[model samples]
Target: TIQPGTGYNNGYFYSYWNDGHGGVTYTNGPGGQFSVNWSNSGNFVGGKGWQPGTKNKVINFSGSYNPNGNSYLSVYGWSRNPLIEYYIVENFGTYNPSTGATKLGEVTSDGSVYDIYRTQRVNQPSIIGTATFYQYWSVRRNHRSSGSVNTANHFNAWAQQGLTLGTMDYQIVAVEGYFSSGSASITVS
Candidate 1:
């Protein structure tokens, strides 16, 4: 059973995390084919996931997944300014919301419909102190999707609707499960 693994080559590191019965293996192939395979065994609440820092640019993501049990995959991302926050929680399951999170309405991005929500958390977790987070979520209405998602489009759509997303902090794609039983698998590129 795979648990977790971390390795660094050149100047980048491949890190993995899991809570109970989940883990992953990765292969960074040539031509930027960063591949990941993961499993969430029965009775689990964890992720075979990794986080990577990125700049404020249009990011294109492509991957495939097969979710089993009561689990799902989400491409979670975050951004921040001095007192404001921004992020995306694109997922393939039930819509989960943070405490005090309010729906902002549905918006379109990269040819998909996303329900937006904004939440304010005190003593913020990121570098910034207290701030608010805007979540652009794509629920399991389609279960699984593949193609490019221009990250900037998220901010663009929000900005047009009078929202603020300062700068990008980091973005990540992970297979997170809660009270999960059974297993699931995924591949990324």
Candidate 2:
């Protein structure tokens, strides 16, 4: 089982963490595949995918996700240059990521409608230490466990709304729990 940290496995980057109570266990499989289980974790995030994520690639993903409490199953990643965090939220439990976000508009992708939002974090933790950055979100109205994410569609939509990403960074299909518990088997390609 993989512990809290970051590493590369089978040509994919894997990150696992349990920042609060309880525990998290994860295993990396061939390519961009991984499985994770957590028990009453106060906060945990784990998954695997490509580093320096490709720009505008259609990410095909499928998985079985069972999450209790506040959690998210999504295409998650970061960007530099402009310093941004982004999510293509596929499914979530108990919490709507759009809760405090300002609705920018909406976009249709992979046969689903996603409401677009942009939020700013001031001097918050980021991939590049503590700094101010923007979070771009494409949250699906109808949650699903398996599907493809046409990243370009979201990217174009964000651009139209004046939310542009910078140099591509690590991107992964991740399961995140906030004071919750969950298990997932995910594959990305």
Backbone collision tally, model 1: 0
Q: Given candidate 1, what's the lDDT at residue 98?
A: 33
Residue 18 displacement in candidate 2 (angstroms): 3.3
- CA lDDT of each prediction against the hidden true structure: 0.47, 0.87
C-alpha RMSD in Å of predicted model 1 compared with the true structure? 5.2
The window of 10 residues in a row where model 1 has the poorest summed lDDT is 42-51
Model 1 TM: 0.59
Candidate 2, superposed: residue stretches over 4 Å from native: none
lDDT of 1 by residue, 59-103 (tens): 444455544444555555555553344444445443253325676
- CA RMSD (A), model 2: 1.2
RMSD of candidates 1 onward, in order: 5.2, 1.2
